[PDB]
A and B are shown apart, each in its own frame.
Chain A
C-alpha cells in the first residue's frame, strides 16, 4: 500500500535526535539574520531582508517583522509562508484570551501555546514540522519587557539579547561582548545595527535591506507603543549612528 512512500517524519535517530527537526534548523540557518535586544526602558527588533532587488517595493512590504497584538511582536527566520500560518494562530489565541479574561495575554502564555503547536508536529500526525524560528518581543504588567525564541522542536527560552537565522554564532559573540544590563533603548538600537553591519554577508548595510521595530514606554504616561520603522526612518537612524 502507501507504507512504501512514508518518510516517517516523527521518529528518533539511533543517537536520540529528531531527523526532521535537525534538518529544519539547517534550513533556518540560511535565512536572513534577525536580532532582538532587551533594554530597561524598551525592546529593539532588527532583521536583515533576504538579498533585495532594486525593483522590489520596499515601503509597502512585510517579510520579517509582524505584529501579534498591541503589546507583542515577532521577528521571523525561515519560511515566510509557514510563519504566517503560525502568526494568524497566535493572533487568534491572543484575542481568545482577551475575550475570556478581559485582559491582554501574558507574553509567556502566548509563546508556550505557539511552541506547543510546533511540538505536536514532531511527535504525531506524520507531517513535516514548521521551518520557522521566532523572536518574540513583548510587554505585560507581570514581567515587563520580555524576549523569547522558539524553534521547530517546540522548545522556547528567554533572553536579554538573542539572534536567529544566519551567522548566529558570530552575532551572539558580538552581543555578549558589548551588552550590559543598565542599557537604554537608544543604545540598544545602535548595538542591533552595528551587529548586523559586521555579520552581514552583503557588501554594505543599507536602509532598503532592513526591517526595524521598537517597543518603548515612550508614549504619554504608563503605556506601551509599537513603532514599525518606515524606510525614511531607517535611512535617518542609519545616518545618525554613522553607518552610512
Chain B
C-alpha cells in the first residue's frame, strides 16, 4: 500500500493505484489490485495499514451490495461516500481504529456527472476534481494545478495521469511497481490493461 490517485474529467472518473505489496526488505507481490467495486457505477481505492485496508474495503462492499439487493436500486456516489465517511468517523474513536485512506470514484446516473471523493482515516471527506493519498499528493497536486482543465476528455485524462506516474517514478524513493488504472463512467467500470 502506498500510491493511490484519482482524476475527475468531463464524463468520467479515473483511478490509479500502485501494484506493489512490500513487507520488510522484500516485495512480496507486484500485481496487487488495491480497489473494490462497491456498485456497478461506484469504485473505491484504498491504502494504509496492512490487513485493515482489505478488511475495511470488503466490509463496505458487503454493506453496499446488501443495500442494492434490499431496495433493488443503486445508491448515488454522494450517498455511498457519506456512508463510508460515517463508518470511518465512528472508527477513529474505537478501541482499535481502521487506519485506511480511500478514494471513491463514481458516476451519478441521475445527474449524468462524474464524482470523485477523498476520505482519510479520520473521516475527512472532500469532493475534488483531482485527489491523492499519502506522499503522492506532494508531487501530483502541484502538477495537476498546472495541467488540469475541467472540460478534458477521458483520453486527455489518461495522458494527464501518465504525466503523474512518470513524475512519481522519477522522484519517489520506493519502487511501487507501476499502477492499475480503472475508468468509471456512464457505462460502468472497466480496467485499462496496457499502462
Listed in ascending order, the chain A residues whose CB lies under 8 Å from chain B are 99-103, 106, 109, 141-142
Contact = CB atoms under 8 A, between A and B. Distances in A.
Contacts of B78: 102-103
B89 to A, nearest CB: 11
**For the complex of A and B, 5 pairs with smallest distance between CB atoms:** A102-B82, A101-B79, A103-B79, A101-B82, A100-B86
The size class of the interface chain B forms with chain A is: 10 to 19
A contacts with B: majority SS: loop
A223 B76 CA distance: 20
A100 B71 contact: no
A100 B75 CA distance: 12
A101 B83 contact: yes
A142 B75 contact: no
B82 A109 contact: no
B79 A109 contact: no
The listed residue with most B CB atoms (<10 A of its CB), out of A99, A101, A106, is: A101
Interface of B: 71, 73, 75-76, 78-79, 82-83, 86, 110
A226 B99 CA distance: 44
Contacts of A99: 86
A56 B83 CA distance: 47
B87 to A, nearest CB: 9
Given A100-B82, A102-B82, 14 more contacts: A99-B86, A100-B83, A100-B86, A101-B75, A101-B79, A101-B83, A102-B78, A102-B79, A103-B78, A103-B79, A103-B82, A106-B71, A109-B71, A141-B110
Contacts of A109: 71
Given A109-B71, A141-B110, A103 B86 contact: no
A109 B75 CA distance: 13
6 contacts: A100-B83, A102-B79, A102-B82, A103-B78, A103-B79, A103-B82
Nearest to A109: B71
A142 B73 CA distance: 9
Contacts of B75: 101
A109 B73 CA distance: 12
The listed residue with most B CB atoms (<10 A of its CB), out of A99, A103, A109, is: A103
A14 to B, nearest CB: 36
A103 B111 CA distance: 14
A54 B39 CA distance: 59
A32 to B, nearest CB: 34
A107 to B, nearest CB: 12
The listed residue with most A CB atoms (<10 A of its CB), out of B73, B76, B78, B82, is: B82
Contacts of B79: 101-103
Contacts of B82: 100-103
Contacts of A101: 75, 79, 82-83
A101 B83 CA distance: 5
